[PDB]
Structures are given as structure tokens and as C-alpha cells.
Amino acid sequence: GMVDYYEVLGVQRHASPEDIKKAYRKLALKWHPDKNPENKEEAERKFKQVAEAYEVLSDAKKRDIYDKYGKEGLNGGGGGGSHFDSPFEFGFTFRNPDDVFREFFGGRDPFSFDFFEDPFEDFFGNRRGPRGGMGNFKSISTSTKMVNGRKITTKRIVENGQERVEVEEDGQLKSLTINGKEQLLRLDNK
């Protein structure tokens, strides 16, 4: 009948490889972890499914199998009674969906721009930019002590060459300094 991966892509069984590429790219954005983190439940599940769907469905070796079977799947060739040459299952494991998207996109929004959607030009940091960026951290020094029953924690965080000191008391930020310039926390109403 049809291959379930088509339903994952949201297309018809007669969709071309190029149309598979379309759905793949579109859904890569649509259900991207950073696109819809609010519904991470539906997003994660479908996002990962898309990885599998694309990789397998787009494989000519699997298409050969599907053509033999008639898109029947379970023992399709036997049920249909077909006689075509096809590749065999050799105990192949499942691939990390994240690695799939890493290969083809880099784990990033397919429809993003390096000149317009610059991660390092984002006040809020909703483009995988600095301020919590992986590989951007040089070194973090953490030291905690007890003062009059109070938990005093000081963190020296170096990121992108910039140093910021964070001093907390019982889990509450008391002082914050950036490159020797103390910032006023009273301005932070987030």
C-alpha cells in the first residue's frame, strides 16, 4: 500500500525523492528542539522520526525493497508473490536522529542565515549564540563557603574571552561583575 515514513513526512506514497527532501527540510525546522521547546514532547518524537524516515526512505536500497514488496512491508514480497532482486537486512542498528540532522544541516535551522540570523547578534540568545554557547567556555572556577549559616558561592566564568563573576547567597544572586565592571542587579526585572 504505502510506507509509513511517508506519513511521518506528511506526503503521499507517490512523492518524489526531491519531495521527500522538501518535507525533511521543512519538518527539520518545524519540530526543531529550539523552534518549539514548549511542546518538546511532540517536537522531540516527530523530529527524531523525521530523521529515520528520511534516511531510510530516501535510500535507493530500501526503495528497491519497497518496489519488490509493493510498499507492503512485512513479508510484502511473499504476500504479493513478486520476483525482484533486492538487498537484505544484515542486522542494521538505528542511527542517532541528532547525528542525521548534524550530517545534513549541522543540527541547525535549515532556513536560517549566517548573515541575518547571527547567533552572536541576538539580545535574547534564542539562536544558539554565546552566553551558554558550547565550546565558547574557556574555564569556570567555583568556590563555596559557609558564612554565618549562609551559603556563599562565587563563580568565575570565562566565555568568549570575557570574564564574569557571580556571587550568590543561599541560591540568590547578590553581586555580579563583568570584566571588572560591577553590574546593578536592580535593573534585572526578568
From Swiss-Prot:
<keyword id="KW-0947">Limb-girdle muscular dystrophy</keyword>
<feature type="region of interest" description="Interaction with HSP70">
    <location>
        <begin position="3"/>
        <end position="128"/>
    </location>
</feature>
<dbReference type="GO" id="GO:0005654">
    <property type="term" value="C:nucleoplasm"/>
</dbReference>
<dbReference type="GO" id="GO:0045892">
    <property type="term" value="P:negative regulation of DNA-templated transcription"/>
</dbReference>
<dbReference type="GO" id="GO:0016020">
    <property type="term" value="C:membrane"/>
</dbReference>
<dbReference type="GO" id="GO:0061077">
    <property type="term" value="P:chaperone-mediated protein folding"/>
</dbReference>
<dbReference type="GO" id="GO:0030544">
    <property type="term" value="F:Hsp70 protein binding"/>
</dbReference>
<dbReference type="GO" id="GO:0090084">
    <property type="term" value="P:negative regulation of inclusion body assembly"/>
</dbReference>
<keyword id="KW-0488">Methylation</keyword>
<dbReference type="GO" id="GO:0030198">
    <property type="term" value="P:extracellular matrix organization"/>
</dbReference>
<protein>
    <recommendedName>
        <fullName>DnaJ homolog subfamily B member 6</fullName>
    </recommendedName>
</protein>
<dbReference type="GO" id="GO:0048471">
    <property type="term" value="C:perinuclear region of cytoplasm"/>
</dbReference>
<dbReference type="GO" id="GO:0044183">
    <property type="term" value="F:protein folding chaperone"/>
</dbReference>
<dbReference type="GO" id="GO:0060717">
    <property type="term" value="P:chorion development"/>
</dbReference>
<dbReference type="GO" id="GO:0005829">
    <property type="term" value="C:cytosol"/>
</dbReference>
<dbReference type="GO" id="GO:0060710">
    <property type="term" value="P:chorio-allantoic fusion"/>
</dbReference>
<dbReference type="GO" id="GO:1900034">
    <property type="term" value="P:regulation of cellular response to heat"/>
</dbReference>
<dbReference type="GO" id="GO:0060715">
    <property type="term" value="P:syncytiotrophoblast cell differentiation involved in labyrinthine layer development"/>
</dbReference>
<keyword id="KW-0597">Phosphoprotein</keyword>
<dbReference type="GO" id="GO:0032880">
    <property type="term" value="P:regulation of protein localization"/>
</dbReference>
<keyword id="KW-0539">Nucleus</keyword>
<feature type="domain" description="J">
    <location>
        <begin position="3"/>
        <end position="70"/>
    </location>
</feature>
<comment type="subunit">
    <text>Homooligomer. Interacts with BAG3, HSPB8 and STUB1. Interacts with ALKBH1. Interacts with HSP70, KRT18 and PTTG.</text>
</comment>
<dbReference type="GO" id="GO:0045109">
    <property type="term" value="P:intermediate filament organization"/>
</dbReference>
<dbReference type="GO" id="GO:0031072">
    <property type="term" value="F:heat shock protein binding"/>
</dbReference>
<dbReference type="GO" id="GO:0030036">
    <property type="term" value="P:actin cytoskeleton organization"/>
</dbReference>
<dbReference type="GO" id="GO:0003677">
    <property type="term" value="F:DNA binding"/>
</dbReference>
<dbReference type="GO" id="GO:0030018">
    <property type="term" value="C:Z disc"/>
</dbReference>
<dbReference type="GO" id="GO:0051087">
    <property type="term" value="F:protein-folding chaperone binding"/>
</dbReference>
<dbReference type="GO" id="GO:0005737">
    <property type="term" value="C:cytoplasm"/>
</dbReference>
<dbReference type="GO" id="GO:0051082">
    <property type="term" value="F:unfolded protein binding"/>
</dbReference>
<dbReference type="GO" id="GO:0034504">
    <property type="term" value="P:protein localization to nucleus"/>
</dbReference>
<dbReference type="GO" id="GO:0050877">
    <property type="term" value="P:nervous system process"/>
</dbReference>
<dbReference type="GO" id="GO:0005634">
    <property type="term" value="C:nucleus"/>
</dbReference>
<dbReference type="GO" id="GO:0001671">
    <property type="term" value="F:ATPase activator activity"/>
</dbReference>
<keyword id="KW-0225">Disease variant</keyword>
<keyword id="KW-0963">Cytoplasm</keyword>
<keyword id="KW-0143">Chaperone</keyword>
<dbReference type="GO" id="GO:0006457">
    <property type="term" value="P:protein folding"/>
</dbReference>
<comment type="function">
    <text>Has a stimulatory effect on the ATPase activity of HSP70 in a dose-dependent and time-dependent manner and hence acts as a co-chaperone of HSP70. Plays an indispensable role in the organization of KRT8/KRT18 filaments. Acts as an endogenous molecular chaperone for neuronal proteins including huntingtin. Suppresses aggregation and toxicity of polyglutamine-containing, aggregation-prone proteins. Also reduces cellular toxicity and caspase-3 activity.</text>
</comment>
<dbReference type="GO" id="GO:0042802">
    <property type="term" value="F:identical protein binding"/>
</dbReference>
